[PDB]
Design a protein around this ligand. Structure first.
Ligand SMILES: OC[C@H]1O[C@@H](O[C@H]2[C@H](O)[C@@H](O)[C@H](O)O[C@@H]2CO)[C@H](O)[C@@H](O)[C@H]1O
Length: 130
């Protein structure tokens, strides 16, 4: 499983527990927002949505066109405009564990009972490795 280099945005990659996904990217200086979606079919098990406008990192799940409760709590925000980030997402048995630049960012408990990776919006990708 070699890394994909300079994948285009919007990105659509086809995808298990204890496996970690690497995403290196870049936030454009004029960026407003971007999204990273772990989807089944158009349902989203984990929606990661950094918004540079108010500096939030919004997490949620999408079932039947309906969003669940938002999770927003963080101790740091690695997604400032004009900055590069090194993101890792480990799929655990009961939750996602997401790190940014080696520092834990958040955990996300599985709500959905995930074979697709979607990345769209104001972001440039350096490489994605599964
Ligand atoms: O929850 C993820 C979801 O949020 C939508 O926007 C929300 C917004 O976060 C919230 O503050 C407001 O009360 O309702 C909005 C729904 O219209 C985004 O539109 C969507 O892309 C997701 O990111």
């Amino acid at each position: 499983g070699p890394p994909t280099f300079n994948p285009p945005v919007p990105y659509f990659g086809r995808l298990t527990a204890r496996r970690t996904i690497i995403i290196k990217g870049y936030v454009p200086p004029t960026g407003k927002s971007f999204a990273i979606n772990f989807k089944v079919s158009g349902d989203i098990a984990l929606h990661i949505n950094p918004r540079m406008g108010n500096g939030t990192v919004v997490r949620n799940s999408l079932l039947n066109g309906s969003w669940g409760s938002e999770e927003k709590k963080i101790t740091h925000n690695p997604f400032g405009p004009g900055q590069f980030f090194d993101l890792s997402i480990r799929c655990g048995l009961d939750r996602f564990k997401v790190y940014a630049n080696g520092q834990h960012l958040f955990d996300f408990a599985h709500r959905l009972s995930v074979d697709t990776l979607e990345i769209q919006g104001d972001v440039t990708l350096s490489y994605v490795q599964i």
